[PDB]
């Protein structure tokens, strides 16, 4: 009842962020790990896997995100919240 996994979060500035997560972590959990490492507030973040935008209350395995998958981080336009 706790298992691990490496994923990568790619920025458009070409930077790659290494995260250790569990398959049953929420997307919200991942944004908040991104806030830990990068200081970017969760509400500014969009995460995208293989084209689809990821919803906050779903899990990594809901989207079939596996070991060494890459997710793309994009920031919301300031003033749109």
């Amino acid at each position: 009842h706790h298992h691990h996994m490496q994923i990568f979060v790619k920025t458009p500035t070409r930077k790659s962020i290494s995260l250790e997560v569990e398959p049953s972590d929420t997307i919200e959990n991942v944004k908040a790990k991104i806030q830990d490492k990068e200081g970017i507030p969760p509400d500014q973040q969009r995460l995208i896997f293989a084209g689809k935008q990821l919803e906050d209350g779903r899990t990594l395995s809901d989207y079939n995100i596996q070991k060494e998958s890459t997710l793309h981080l994009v920031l919301r336009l300031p003033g749109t919240i």
Binding site: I48, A50, G51, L73, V74, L75, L77, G79
Partner: protein, 370 residues
């Protein structure tokens, strides 16, 4: 000729500061969002009034300094690739182009309009921006055609592939149709280059057409809505019939200014291949560069690297398509030919001319050629 054009440009009725004031208030920590609200709620007539900018909680009597810091900070947020309005060029990490997947933020078209206004505002009010674009984008601003060579700054790897195709038999080597792959965040979506394109095989017979169609799609078609939104914002301050008095290299200098180049920093961070610093031709090269003025040097830089833009910590941090690439001079080519540049590597191929005047003239023709 640039100087005369500028004066003429600044002498137009459309460029007169309108009576009254334009008031802009922003929080430093929220400059993007605040400036967006402040600037979009006003009409073009309003923003042509005298510009008055104040940061919340900060005294503002030094108007020029406050103004300069405003355009500096704002352009670094607008053009920050995180927001996916603009993204890096293909041959460095400080020059920029429109990000085709900007639509991931549903509201992007308005923000492209806002950026066009910010850039138009900088020009209208004599405030230079840190806004250096790929060559194709200046051309599109000026309503000039783009060619395959313009791809180099947009997608250098795709640029190399198309050249290899043009120069090599593809029959039985590449399974290719008149379609393109539109990447978006891990997904691949297919677009036809011409009607029924994905069902039309590319051959050695028709590949020229394929290349020209690809070039047009990638550089011009795929960013159309974004570009139109941008020009809409821009032309609201700078009428198109006036800004086309400039060519694409002058437009860059008009928007971002002309840097004062440290010649010694430059010399110190230059590589030589096939030559040595002591060689006569290398000395003629630096003689020519030293005696030139700031605009003329900026033009050599546009020729060699794609941009007149100098990195914050100097010529040591010059970038290429594959990472850091120093300004480089190589002995290559014959005395008949002009010097030839490689903007992916910041490398000038300089044949060993035997007298100074032919070299200055060869290099002048090479730099001035469009």
């Amino acid at each position: 000729d640039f100087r005369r054009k500028v004066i003429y440009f600044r002498s137009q009725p459309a460029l007169r500061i309108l009576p009254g004031q334009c008031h802009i208030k922003v929080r430093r920590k929220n400059i993007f969002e605040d400036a967006y609200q402040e600037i979009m709620r006003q009409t073009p007539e309003d923003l042509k009034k005298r510009l008055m900018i104040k940061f919340d909680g900060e005294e503002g009597l030094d108007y020029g300094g406050v103004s300069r810091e405003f355009f500096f900070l704002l352009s670094h947020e607008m053009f920050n690739p995180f927001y996916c309005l603009f993204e890096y060029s293909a041959y460095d990490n400080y020059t920029i182009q429109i990000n085709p997947n900007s639509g991931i933020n549903p509201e992007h078209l308005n923000y492209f309009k806002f950026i066009g206004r910010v850039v138009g505002l900088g020009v209208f009010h004599r405030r230079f921006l840190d806004a250096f674009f790929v060559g194709a984008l200046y051309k599109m601003m000026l309503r000039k055609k783009v060619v395959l060579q313009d791809m180099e700054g947009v997608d250098a790897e795709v640029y190399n592939s198309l050249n290899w195709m043009l120069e090599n038999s593809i029959d039985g080597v590449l399974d290719l149709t008149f379609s393109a792959d539109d990447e978006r965040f891990g997904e691949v979506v297919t677009v036809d280059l011409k009607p029924d394109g994905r069902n039309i095989e590319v051959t050695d017979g028709n590949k020229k057409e394929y290349v020209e169609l690809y070039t047009q799609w990638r550089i011009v078609d795929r960013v159309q809505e974004q570009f139109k939104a941008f020009m809409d914002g821009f032309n609201e301050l700078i009428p198109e019939d006036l800004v086309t008095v400039f060519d694409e290299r002058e437009l860059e200098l008009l928007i971002g200014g002309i840097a004062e180049i440290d010649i010694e920093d430059w010399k110190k961070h230059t590589d030589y291949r096939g030559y040595q610093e002591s060689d006569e031709v290398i000395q003629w090269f630096w003689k020519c560069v030293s005696e030139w003025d700031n605009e003329q040097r900026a033009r050599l830089l546009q020729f060699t690297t794609g941009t007149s833009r100098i990195p914050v910590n100097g010529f040591k941090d010059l970038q290429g398509s594959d990472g850091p690439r120093r300004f480089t001079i190589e002995k290559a080519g014959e005395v008949q030919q002009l010097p030839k540049s490689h903007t992916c590597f910041n490398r000038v191929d300089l044949p060993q001319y035997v007298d100074y005047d032919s070299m200055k003239q060869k290099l002048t023709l090479a730099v001035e050629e469009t």
